């Protein structure tokens, strides 16, 4: 894609917006659908986010390869664990409600 | 003539092997509120992500489920002040980052760039953060 | 005359011809009653009267040439239009533009900054330039106005050397100054290479290391907004076709 | 002698010294023509004084009313008070429209009219119909920052050619051999090294020397270095005594306030609120020639109508103009007035006073940009050496330059040197050898200033020279004062033997570079004030209160019918040629005739001297 970098920049913002929209959605319509939407958006937004950080702060072909590899693992496992929490346990929305009861 | 790339390669080549010092930056530079809020936005984003990661790791690795830990904590019937404190601490970064995040999306549409508007939006972000955070730590 | 007002200036020093010399800060005292109102007046008095080894770039003396950019009291600015601070209880610290290789004292090596500017091809380009010189190109008052706030730049570098992204990735991030000039050519109605100018910024660094910190605009001695120009480039990147 | 300094040798077809408007245009013109060209400059190009230019550049484009370049020719010739060479003036003015259209096509962002064409404003001393038709509007501009745009546009344009730049290299002298220039020797300021650039042709475009004075609009870097190189080479400089005091430098800082202010309707006012120029120049008023307005303002101040607490300046008033106009036509000075005088130009007048601004004199050239020498009554080009821009005396400006004519001169003669070299040489011709030790004396002098340890420090000797020119070679002059000034300067020059410098390094040693600049300014200053003392007549900016008349070969104030023409030796309508013996600092003068012929009498009539008034 000759327009890769700008298509990424646009997706990043599309996702940030997406996630903003999920906050009200979690409060007003909690349940599976939002629970998975949040698992996917929290991971995607955080993965791109931590990647801009590596990009600004990590230098050298190898240290960059390493940071990005470690990030891809952190993210894959993070989206996995969140889907897991949603399938086998109460799920993000309900967990927040419960924690807010303490 | 030297092309721009050649000029760039010799600059690095000359200087990295020179004995020239690198002038100070971050240790001498004057802060501003916008600058401070900027790096706080990055710091809250990283913290929020690390938190979401730690929580998903606990989901894959701890022996009990969420309801047991909630109950455990409750069985300590902790003081309301402390509870409030903690909820406030939890929601503040999320809060700060969401509102300043909205300010960044507004900048992405090209609006609010006069420097005096940058100072205004930052302060509107701080007060909404504080308000929404006291609001929520109270629910 | 008789009744002084002595100000102290703590200024960055480093001599490359003194083997093993280390950067140090030197302090000078100047009678504000016998010096011009600007920091450059002070730097010139010091050089002329106390220490002619103090070295710095300067030329126009009215803030149009861009030579004297440096960091004063924590911020990047032109010494020649920067008022000397009258509160005598404070020492004004002076350093070279930030995160730059120091040639000597307050003189940074700006050659990478200039090579980034050459790389965006800052000159008018027409598809058919076979008519260069025959007649004036027409441009409306309204399209000429689009250039206001972009063309006044004096390439002093206060902005890019204030930008933390530029501090961390100055080898590949073009920085605020050059990006605002690339925008100045992208919107000149008389230029025919807008898509190619945008196409050149399709990589992770040239443009995208800007995260809207806004130090650039706060620091500009000409009152320009490079941070805004950049946001307008990002929008064009996101919408142009072909 | 010993090379304590390593020497690098370069060979090019051509070398351009200077990278302001004239040098950049000459240097890429040469590369565009195929010549392997080097451009040597002591500043990064866009820092050059050209960047500070404001009001505009003239060309009869006729975008505001019908115009004729010959009307411009006339204005310039009258403005030069007949000390201008009309062949050069012909070339300059006829070439103007194409030179400006060239800049616009390069991308120069000129302000625009309702037709999308370049906007032009009124400026001083310009008219329609050879003087009979009212105010011209031919000064093309980019609001009031024309210089800035002109320089940035030329610089961006040079980036398209293969010109080799040696930025922040300080040229020391010319490499002369047998009356011919073989190149130049320079100090690379960044690494302390010495470089000799050999080339078949050398172009000098180093700027003026306003800094020989104490108060000037000129940048700190306007120190006549190229001029001094010519002088050191034993070549003549010309008309150096004609120094332009611009009517309006801001009081105190000296910053230029554009004549565009008055071109757009601003007015000069004395302490009594009188628009005194209606009195001194009833027709032109505040748009009369600069030598005139400056003399008038100066008269108003010594006669008591001065403004401010010391009654020592006057007022430039713009507040009666609509604010949009000031914001659109005059934004730079609007900002400058406030930063340097605290004035809000929509409310209060700007404090102003006549300020040394520009050098009419310089290295003499023919209209093709070739430097000339003058032997036994004839002009001879110096093979291999060209000059253009304020450092030259072509002379399109004679005794007084019209505003907006210098930026024009820059581009027209910088292109002219490139054209002339291109019709005279071919790229790649063998570059002339230079004796193995060419330049060694430049290094010797440099080494000697580095370690200088006398009793008079560089800044001291410089301030001495500045205050001397300031009170002895000002707007109004007289023999006694000029003579005193001459002797004080000659003394200060002997005194350079006692210079003390402190910096002993070689990398970015501005202690030493500014000492080389002092030598340079001293050579220019000596030629100026001795040329002035010798000139017993009043012409353009050179006003002698003891020789109040302009003296030409005829009395052009009565019919020439039955008038005995005066002998070359008994009148002053001739260029001054100054030479300096650098060891002693003694000045020699000679004169050469002004050229009245144009490039084509059928196309552009030569204009005979006449009484000059606005
Ligand atoms: C002072 C001034 C002059 C001026 C003006 C406003 C101000 C504040 N506004 C003008 C206007 O609106 N219209 C107009 O026609 N003229 C105006 N002027 C006068 C005009 O600007 C100057 O006459 C003109 O710009 C002259 O420029 P030129 O090209 O001749 O050179 P320069 O810009 O002054 O630059 C000198 C160059 O030479 C190099 N140099 C000098 N010494 C050395 C040594 N030793 N070695 C190598 N290079 C040298 C400098 O680096 C510089 O590039
Ligand atoms: C929970 C959230 C997580 C786990 C999260 C995490 C991240 C991270 C790690 C960053 C990168 C920081 C940086 O680039 O400096 C990022 C940046 C940002 N996020 Fe979030 N954030 C969250 C919610 C939100 C919300 C609801 C919005 C709206 C928001 C808007 C932003 C935007 C706009 C940026 C880009 C900042 C820039 O351009 O510099 N995020 N976030
Ligand atoms: C020392 C690090 C934290 C400083 C945070 C706030 O800092 C302040 O912000 C103001 C508004 O932008 C500025 O005008 C002011 O100079 C600055 O000190
Ligand atoms: O008043 C000006 O803008 C000016 O200084 C122009 C010339 O030509 O010298
Ligand atoms: S945008 Fe401002 S600060 Fe940046 S280089 Fe240009 S004038 Fe200097
Ligand atoms: S300070 Fe830097 S991050 Fe962007 S807005 Fe300015 S270039
Ligand atoms: S000396 Fe020219 S910008 Fe300060």
XYZ file of C-alpha atoms in Angstrom, chain B residues 2-5 7-8 10-12 14-16 18-30 32-35 38 42 104 107-115 118-119, chain C residues 12 14 23 71 73-76 93 95-103 109 111-112 115 118-119 162 167-168 170-171 211-215 217-219 225 227-228 231-232 235:
86
model
C 25.659 16.742 -2.422
C 22.105 15.482 -2.398
C 20.062 15.861 0.811
C 20.645 12.156 1.775
C 24.258 15.615 3.441
C 22.418 13.693 6.096
C 27.851 12.942 6.393
C 26.327 14.845 9.215
C 25.971 11.782 11.312
C 31.114 13.565 11.030
C 29.473 14.240 14.382
C 29.208 10.755 15.961
C 33.626 13.982 16.699
C 34.347 15.052 20.177
C 31.431 17.535 19.927
C 29.142 17.481 22.974
C 25.316 17.175 22.598
C 23.712 20.382 24.038
C 21.298 19.767 26.938
C 17.578 19.474 26.288
C 15.187 17.808 28.678
C 17.290 18.878 31.711
C 17.208 22.639 30.782
C 13.970 23.080 28.927
C 11.131 25.159 30.403
C 4.485 24.436 30.127
C 1.100 22.988 31.067
C 0.462 21.663 27.511
C 3.867 19.969 27.593
C 1.206 15.692 26.834
C 1.229 9.006 27.159
C -6.438 14.922 20.626
C -6.900 18.424 17.186
C -6.871 15.608 14.550
C -9.750 17.433 12.878
C -7.540 20.496 12.780
C -9.401 22.561 15.484
C -8.150 24.259 18.637
C -4.624 25.020 17.481
C -4.248 28.659 18.540
C -1.901 28.398 21.470
C -4.471 24.803 23.623
C -4.168 26.321 27.081
C 27.092 27.646 28.097
C 32.747 24.665 25.227
C 31.078 21.970 28.656
C 17.833 28.635 24.368
C 15.655 31.045 30.210
C 14.494 27.553 29.246
C 12.921 28.495 25.938
C 14.148 28.639 22.321
C 20.805 30.947 31.729
C 22.346 27.392 26.205
C 22.679 26.398 22.556
C 19.464 25.142 20.729
C 18.652 21.830 22.397
C 19.896 18.333 21.619
C 22.249 19.545 18.856
C 25.951 18.922 18.347
C 27.840 21.944 19.617
C 30.490 23.277 17.168
C 25.660 22.178 13.821
C 23.453 20.961 8.734
C 21.054 18.031 9.176
C 19.425 18.820 4.560
C 16.477 20.491 0.899
C 14.830 17.091 0.868
C 12.023 22.508 20.981
C 15.091 15.331 19.998
C 14.485 11.539 19.853
C 15.881 13.867 14.468
C 17.582 11.595 12.008
C 2.004 13.681 18.422
C 0.839 17.299 18.915
C 3.012 18.264 21.853
C 2.769 21.995 20.692
C 6.134 23.145 22.007
C 4.157 26.809 18.173
C 4.693 28.136 21.673
C 8.331 28.770 20.872
C 1.847 27.828 14.115
C 1.737 22.529 14.925
C -1.345 23.607 13.011
C -2.400 18.842 11.485
C -3.520 20.151 8.085
C -5.654 15.600 6.952
